Structures are given as C-alpha cells and as structure tokens.
RNA sequence: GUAUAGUUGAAGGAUUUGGAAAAUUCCGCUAAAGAGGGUGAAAGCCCCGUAGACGAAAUGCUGACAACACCUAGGAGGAUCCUGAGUACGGCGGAACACGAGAAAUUCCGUCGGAAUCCGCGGGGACCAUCCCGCAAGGCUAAAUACUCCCUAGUGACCGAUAGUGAACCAGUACCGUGAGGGAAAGGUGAAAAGCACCCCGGAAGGGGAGUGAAAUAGAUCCUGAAACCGUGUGCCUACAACAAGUCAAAGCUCGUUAAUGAGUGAUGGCGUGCCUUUUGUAGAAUGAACCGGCGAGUUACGAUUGCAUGCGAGGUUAAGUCGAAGAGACGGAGCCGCAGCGAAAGCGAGUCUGAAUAGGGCGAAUGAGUAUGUAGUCGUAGACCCGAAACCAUGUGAUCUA
RNA sequence: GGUAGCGGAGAAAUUCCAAACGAACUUGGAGAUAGCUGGUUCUCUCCGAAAUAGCUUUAGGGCUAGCCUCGGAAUUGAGAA
RNA sequence: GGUGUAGUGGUAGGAGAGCGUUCUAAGGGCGUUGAAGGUCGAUCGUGAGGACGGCUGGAGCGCUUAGAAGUGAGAAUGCCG
RNA sequence: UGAAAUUUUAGUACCUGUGAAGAUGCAGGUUACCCGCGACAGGACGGAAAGACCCCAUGGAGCUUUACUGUAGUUUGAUAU
C-alpha cells in the first residue's frame, strides 16, 4: 500500500522551490509581558531548515 | 502471409523449421534461428506494421 | 548476438546475502551489532520519534488556511510562442497539439520571458502587464477571450 | 448443434558389443502424424497413441423459428376532482455517513409533540432571500461482479519420502483422556518368482555344498550402503613415569608412491592453560554442547528515496480494457512528472511578501534537464531475521474423583 | 439423581470442583506482546572506530551532534608540525 | 608491459572481486567397452575448492554463456532417528 | 536376566605462589613401577530443580480504600398509557 504523509507537518510547513522548507517560529502565542521588544519583533519572521532535522523528517513529507 | 493452408500444413518437419505468420513475429522466434525464408507479400505486410 | 549473451557493463549487480559465516563480513548479527531495540526482530521506533522530547512538529505552531476557490493558471512564458512564425490564432487548441500545453488548468495565462520577434496573435484568458507591451511592440494583436 | 460408450488411422532391415538393444556401423522409407507413455538399456518406422476422418438406440442441455399466451394509440380544452398520514418535520437520547456535537446539512432508531395539496412540496453541508434542479411517505427487474465440496481435459525455471496433504502403505487408523479434544512411524529384490529340488550338521532357528540367475557380498529386515558404535589379524612403540594430548628438532625399525627436497611408526629434547556466547576482564570455579547423521533463521507484494545502466530529451509516458498460445504486441492520451515563483489569502508574475517607503530584509530567477523501465543499497505498511513467557477475551466439555 | 467457572460448594483452611485452582479443562482471536535472554551457515582483498555533550516518566532504551566508511565538486593552499 | 619508491596487525562496521549447490534456456559433449553415489591415494591453485588413477556400483550426467533461488551448519538447557 | 540420573576431548599427584582476586591442567620445587578388588566421603565451586532472598520490567494477577472514570441495583420528578 501507499505511504501516508504526516498530518501534523502539512499544517505547519510549506515547501519552497529551492528545495528547503519554510518554518514558522515559536514563542508567539502566549504571555508577552515577560518578553522584550526586540524578541517580539524578531519572532514574526520565518526561518529555514536546519540540516539535522531534514534527515529524519524527509520521508514523512514525501510529497507535500 | 495469411491462410496458406496448403503451405502451413507442411511444417511439422525436423526441428530445422518453425513457422510464424506475418502477425506473430516476436523476437525469440527470430534470434534463435540462423536463416529466414519469407515470401514477397510477407515482407510487405511486415513493412506496413513496422512502417 | 545469439542465444549462447552479454549484459552492458555495470548493468546488473549481484546481491549481498546476510548471516552466512564470519568471513563475508555480515555473519553473527547481520550488520546490527550488539543488543538494543534496533537489533531485535521488527524493532526500531516510528518515524520522527525523538524519545520523550517533544518533537519538532509539536513545538512550532499551526498556520494558515486553504481557499476553496483557488483558480490558478497554466503558464506559458513567451519564448514558447516564438516558433509559430506569422499568423496562427494561438488558442487553447492548436497551440497545444504538438506537445506544448497538455492539461490546461483554468485557462492559459501568458508571461513575459524573454524575447519575441514575430507578428503573432493570441487568445488566452489572462495576460501580464508586460506581455501585452512585448507583443504589441512586435506588432501582433491580443484579446482576452 | 452438444454432453455421456467408440471406429479407423502412414512408414526398417542386416552387422558389432551384449544376458537382453531402441545403443553403434551401412543402406532405406514416412510425415495434415517428430506431443507423450510402454517394451529384457536411450525407438519417427514394435505396442498404446497423436494429425486427419467418421459415428449415437437412450436420457439431458443450448441455440433457432413456428404456434399459443401477453403488453402497447393521436390532437385540443382546463370550471370541478385525484396524485401514497399519525407520514413529512421539530424537541429530547443514541447510532450510520471519512465527519468523535462540532458552525453540523443528508440517513435510521426509541419516546413525546405534529403539517400542506400544484398560488403545493423537497434539495443545492447551520440560516434567510433570489435563482436552478427535482416529486418522497407503494412493489418487480437480466448482464457486466465474488467463491469451488465435486466432474472432465490440461499446465508449472512446483516437492521427490524428516520433503509434498497430518495421511504415497487398509490414517483421522493404532495409541492417549470420563469427555470436549489431541495423533504418529512405516515406499524400492530381479527383466522374468525362474523365491534354492536334492545331500550334510542341528530339536528347531541358522548354516555348508549343489542348482536358478549376467550378478546371491540382489535370499525376502532383499537396489546403492556413509558416520558414531562393536569386533579379528598384524608393520612400529610402551612397565622410574606428571602428558589441553600438539607442534619443532630427531636415533632406530619397517615399506615402496599421482616420482619427489618419499610413506608409516617414534626412544629422546625445547616450547605450549581447549571451542563458543557475554564482558572493563576468561583457561575459568560466569554460560552451552554425551557422540554421529538429517532438518533448522533478513524473504515477498505494494509505496518512497539514492547510486549504476539503457531509450528518448524541453519533453517523457502509459492505466483499466478489446483482439492474441495463461505468450511480444499492436490499439487505448482519461491521467501522472518536469518546464515559474512568491504570499495564510484575495492576487501579482522573473518577480513577489512585510512595509508609509522607488529604503532594507526573506525566498526566487541570471546556461543551470527531466522522464520510463531494469538492477542494487536503505526505510514504511504488512507476523517482517526466527525461537521463548506470566497473563486477556469468546464459544464449548466435566460432580464416575471430591464438597 | 441435582448444583458449573463473572460460577458452584464449604461445622471457614484461599478448602475442593478428574493426581494442578491469588480463579478448572479443550478449541478459537493467535505466528498475541516483550526497550529482555540465546542463536544466525563460503572465502579473500582495502579502510577501520566508540564507551562523550545535550534532552528524555529518561538512567542496561531512543534522538541529533562528535569519531568510521564510500561517491562526487571546487578554488586551492584553506590541514599538520 | 622489464624497472624504481611506498604500503600490507585488527572487533562492531563500510567497500570490492571470486569459490560451491539445485533448476531453466541455447550451443557443443560423455555413457552397459560402465553415468550419478561410496572408499583409497605420496596431486594442483593464494582462498573457498578442482582434476587424474585403483576398487565398489548399475542408469543417467557433465562443459561454456546468460538467468531464477526453499543457495552453504558446530553450538538455540534446538527437533527427529 | 539386566536399567537409570550425568557426560567438551582426557595418559587426571602434593606444596608455596600466580591468576575476575581459594587451581588436577599455569610457574618453581618435592614425591611417584604397570592393572585391579572391598570399604570411607575431603575435593571435582559434585548431580537433580534457567534462586525458595533482593532489584528492574514504564511486567502480570488477587485484595482494600474518603485514589480517578464509570456501572448493575435502590430511590425521586416530569411526561405517555
């Protein structure tokens, strides 16, 4: 039978055109009065793939 | 060629001879043999399918 | 070449049979080493498991939605047109009909990369704001039908 | 027309080795038949057959076309009448829909409420309006689809007696348990039984002659007949000796090979704590093997990814399905992958997002090649390298023992 | 003759229910499950480690990072002493 | 392809090339003047292994090229004899 | 007449040492012709039973409770008959 892709990563990660993946940062949906104002600016913007976690995840997101 | 029923009913010979019509010519029927006899019209009906 | 045969060079490997004596290199535990659950029968954890550490997908947040009525097109840029020399009515038929646009998706859009020197005529369903200028520079005619 | 008995069906002799030829050597003949089996060894021409041709009293089956049954009419009008009731639908509580009450449409079930009648009623994923498509609450219906206890005719890069059915042999038998239940081992003389008349020892069993036979060291536990294990005879050595049992050196004694820098045996001297598994560590007094023989563990299907090879190459490629020998072998362009990205999205496009910004930044583009099949390495779903529990759930069987 | 396993019976001991009862026996789900034991069969050549950090209802398990190996690419001079 | 220089201990493991078993296909062969199997031999190759001869044995089997696997045994307080 | 448990191959000496840390087998010395028969039980960490004690399995089972979630039963209200 076919593989089944993960439905936790399809709702969190979208694939770019160069090969990598776009990722949305964390620590954004909670208390903010603890955090500073440089932090809450610099945690709006998306980051890329670290090549450690691209190994074990690659086969799950086989087509999406 | 086609129903040459008086020329196809005379090939239950020695194993020198195996006989294929103009449609069922495969690869193993040809590569195994050493020479091929063929009529004129069989060559034309080969050159229709094989363009 | 007859029945009594040669493959191409490098065309066909052999195999590697595992667990057949201690001088092939894979006898006594078969390339698995000592104990542990990577070395039992049918062991190994599921994919993406990292111990009880919360894995990467339960660490970063869910985001977005999908439109139900997304209508995206079947882009041809501009150089693909540059072999229909003069006067064709480029269209969602005869344009395709040689191996150009199989499976139009929602009608054909045209883009502007990168040089057209003909006098064609185009019938598509959308156009960029530079492909019209590139076509009318070369003296053609366009219509969004 | 077919199913259940059938008929007919071509062509060879001699020699050599043989116990016996189909084997060998010469010279022939046949084929709409050179597929297979049998005969004193391996057969186109010995036999049974095969290709072809022919054939049915009786019963059953399937076409056909006759008869007999059935069934089926137009155009216009629109005053009045009919068109499936405790039904539709709602509240409450559950189930079925990929949908777990969720913003929850559509389908049922239990209970309690409960409509309209063509100016009507339902549906288009809460709900309303507009538009569009449809008439529930009455029945019947062939084929394309899944299976094989059994019958006939076939095939296999399927097994060859610990294999293959548990069962090639009088096997669900012998045997075990009150019962439900569990369940084995065991194939082969030779071509022909021609299976040893007769004599001798012995109570017999058993044996030695004599015969049958090509062979009896093929004599019925009967083709071949390995290993552990038990014996007989002999070339060399051994009764002052501490030996993981070997190897290195070596006097004497005997022997004569796939001929060569020979074979057997070994007085005497040096050196030397077995084999596995598990461990920081083994000779271990950690853990396994009585010996010999047989059987006994990383595979296959469907996907994903990468290396190698092959054909095309800005393109590549079929699927289900029809004809075809369970086949190669053509039709079949629905579909899938690459050729353009960015954004959650409306959208824009070699550019786009955030932003007041023509600023900066992210991600793209600037020659930047994929695709189909084979093969190999790895992974996922399946029992997935095999062997091993204590326990869990659902049908059944037992109070002849004991309370 | 009667009483049956979620049960029966007990002048009470977790006692008996076909030599076994902290819940009988037989068949079926069932090749149950096991981060744990033991085993895994022919040979040669080339290279050849680790017993560490972080996190883990984790501490004899796993994950990435470090150390090994094979195939490419690119200027080099980036490596060393 | 003479000849130089350098290198060749090794567990888990990675890489490369070969030996051997049964079956299929095509070509070429052996066999009652003795095939497969068994026994003995003082033989050849770097390895797994391969020949030749003597005895037994009584109907089938090798060699070359490619292919497919129920493809190799010394240990499981293994199962059967 | 005729078994059984066990069993890596055994031509199986003593002392002081050495050694995963008390040896028939290692080292260095002492003692010792070859083969049996009846008795004793110091040793071969002797034989039988994959610890009767302890810890772990992110193991089971049986029992208790003001541990969590439920439920048979018992009760009360509306509604129907």
């Amino acid at each position: 039978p076919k593989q089944k892709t993960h439905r936790g990563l399809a709702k969190r990660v979208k694939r770019t055109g160069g090969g990598g993946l776009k990722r949305g940062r964390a620590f954004t949906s909670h208390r903010f009065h603890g955090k500073t104002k440089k932090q809450r600016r610099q945690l709006r913007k998306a980051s890329m793939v670290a090549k450690g976690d691209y190994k074990r995840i690659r086969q799950q997101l086989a087509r999406m | 060629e086609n129903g040459n029923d008086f020329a196809a009913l005379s090939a239950r010979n020695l194993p020198n001879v195996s006989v294929v019509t103009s449609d069922n010519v495969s690869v193993l029927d040809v590569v195994s043999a050493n020479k091929v006899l063929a009529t004129q019209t069989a060559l034309t009906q080969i050159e229709e399918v094989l363009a | 070449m007859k029945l009594h045969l040669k493959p191409a060079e490098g065309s066909r490997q052999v195999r590697n049979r595992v667990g057949r004596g201690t001088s092939s290199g894979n006898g006594k535990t078969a390339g698995r080493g000592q104990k542990g659950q990577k070395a039992r029968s049918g062991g190994g954890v599921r994919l993406g498991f990292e111990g009880g550490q919360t894995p990467l997908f339960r660490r970063l947040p869910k985001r977005g939605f999908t439109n139900i009525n997304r209508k995206d097109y079947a882009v041809v840029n501009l150089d693909t047109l540059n072999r229909f020399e003069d006067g064709t009515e480029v269209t969602p038929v005869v344009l395709k009909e040689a191996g150009i646009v199989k499976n139009e998706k929602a009608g054909i859009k045209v883009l502007a990369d990168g040089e057209l020197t003909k006098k064609l005529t185009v019938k598509a369903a959308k156009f960029s704001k530079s492909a019209q200028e590139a076509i009318e520079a070369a003296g053609g005619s366009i219509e969004v039908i």
Side-chain angles (χ1 to χ4, degrees), chain B residues 2-36:
Chain B
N2 282 319
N4 288 321
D5 296 332
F6 297 103
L9 267 293
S10 294
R12 280 80 181 270
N13 213 170
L14 295 172
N16 291 317
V17 171
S18 62
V19 161
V20 180
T21 71
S22 66
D23 292 333
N24 283 316
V25 176
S26 67
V27 182
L28 281 179
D29 289 334
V30 183
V31 182
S32 66
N34 285 319
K35 288 183 179 180
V36 174

Side-chain angles (χ1 to χ4, degrees), chain A residues 1-3 14-19 22 45-46 48 59 62-63:
Chain A
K2 295 178 182 180
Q3 284 181 350
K14 290 182 175 67
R15 178 172 287 167
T16 69
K22 281 179 68 69
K45 297 181 179 181
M48 285 296 292
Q59 193 179 3
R63 286 183 181 176

Side-chain angles (χ1 to χ4, degrees), chain C residues 83-133:
Chain C
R83 53 187 174 90
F84 285 169
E85 62 276 14
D86 275 320
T88 52
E89 278 189 353
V90 179
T91 177
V93 283
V94 183
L95 166 67
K96 51 171 185 177
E97 284 191 356
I100 290 94
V101 181
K102 299 187 284 290
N103 190 9
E104 65 171 0
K105 294 178 98 291
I108 300 172
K109 189 174 184 180
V110 178
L111 291 183
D113 192 2
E115 286 184 355
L116 189 146
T117 61
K118 296 295 180 66
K119 199 183 265 78
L120 305 177
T121 173
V122 183
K123 184 184 289 186
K126 199 67 64 65
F127 289 93
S128 75
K129 204 174 87 273
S130 297
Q132 286 184 355
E133 298 182 357

